[PDB]
Structures are given as structure tokens and as C-alpha cells.
DNA sequence: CCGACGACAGATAATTTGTCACTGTACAGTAGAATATAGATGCGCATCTATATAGATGCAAATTGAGTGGCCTTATTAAATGACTTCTCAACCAGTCA
């Protein structure tokens, strides 16, 4: 029922024809997932353009959802011996300019800042700490 | 009785609008154009590959012609046919007769 094509613009120019066909002849849906790159590959041809034009956006954490999703990763990744509350406003401030709302930098920093707190023994994250691993960046 | 504040009315420059006279300034051939870069696309030429072999060779039956080896009644007589060998192949004188 369908085809998942990942970093789909390492695909060369001419194998497009072959993943339209797919898509056209069976009753396969067929994915292409990329950055802003792909589209500029993709504009480049009116033919696949048209049969790849509705398309789903995935953005960056913002206000509540920034600040909700931190203890999310606190509680569902972290999991320390006790809670840093890394929703806390000086922790989020922190956590803002080095993470500018990816969840790659915000799941990289944790694993490090909690990985370091662990390794040095403290039992949760606290403002130097994050700050010695958040200025690395 | 004296002093201070509000109502009502009256006069007045600030504000806005309009009109009028004097004036600085653009019209004077001219900014679309030159000069780099990256990035994608296409045509050409070389540099491999994988398939496709038919010719040559080795070998193994399939007779095939040409060999070689092993097994078998005999002695007399007679006739017939066909052959071989041997031998022989004088000539005139002396005594009767019609």
C-alpha cells in the first residue's frame, strides 16, 4: 500500500521515471522525505512535481510546546535519580539559545548534560553544568 | 462687612483657510550593464565486461576386415575314362605241281 523513500534527493534525475511508474501502474503510495533541498530538485521537473504536490511540514518547538516537551525528555529519557526541572524559566532560557527549538540539539544536550552530571555523581543538572555543555556548541 | 468662587455675557488673539506676489530649480544624450562564480545538463569518446562461439583434441564403443587354431576310416578285387613305359615291325632258297 506504500513506499518510503528517505533523503529522497540522492535519487539521480533519471530514476524519478521509475518511481512514478511504481506509483502510477500499482496502487502503491509512494513517500518522499527531505529537507528544502528536495524541492529545489524536485521543481526542476514539472512531470513529478504534480505527482508529489501535497506534502506534510514538520517545524521547531516554540513557547508551550518547547517548555511541555522538556520534561517530557526529563521524565521519558533522562529518568535521573531526582528531577532537575528543566521547565524551569533560567533552565529553559539555557536551553533556548542552545537548542533554537530542534529536538536533535534538545535530545543531544540532555544526553550529554545528563551523561556529565552522572559521570561527575550529581543526582540531577543544575545552571553551571548545562551552561560548561551548552557554550561547547 | 470682607474675601473667594461660579454663571452668564462680552471682547479677543491663535488657528486654519484662502489669496497674492516673488523665487530656486530642472529642461538640458544617458544606469541598464559589466564581470565573476556555482550548479545542473548534455554529447562525445575511451575502457572495460560478458556472451558466443567453431575448430581442435582426446577418448570410447562399434563394428570390420584380416588372420589363426582345432577337428577328421581303410585295405583288396573288378569295370570305366584319362595318361605313361617296354617290345616288335628279315628277304630268297629249297622242296612240289599242273
Known amino acids: 500500500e506504500m513506499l518510503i523513500i528517505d533523503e529522497a534527493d540522492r535519487l539521480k534525475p533519471e530514476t524519478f521515471a521509475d518511481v512514478r511508474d511504481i506509483a502510477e ?17 524536485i521543481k526542476r521537473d514539472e512531470q513529478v512535481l504534480e505527482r508529489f504536490r501535497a506534502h506534510l511540514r514538520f517545524g521547531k518547538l516554540s513557547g508551550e510546546d518547547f517548555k511541555n516537551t522538556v520534561e517530557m525528555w526529563e521524565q521519558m529519557v533522562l529518568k535521573l535519580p531526582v528531577s532537575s526541572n528543566l521547565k524551569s524559566k533560567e533552565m529553559l532560557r539555557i536551553l533556548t539559545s542552545a537548542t533554537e527549538g ?36
Open 25 to 41: 501502474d500499482l496502487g502503491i503510495a509512494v513517500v518522499l522525505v527531505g529537507t528544502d533541498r528536495l524541492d529545489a530538485v
Open 102 to 137: 530542534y529536538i536533535g540539539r534538545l535530545d543531544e544536550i540532555l544526553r550529554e548534560a545528563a551523561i556529565r552530571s552522572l559521570s561527575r555523581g550529581l543526582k540531577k543538572i543544575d545552571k553551571a553544568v548545562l551552561q560548561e555543555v551548552a557554550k561547547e556548541y
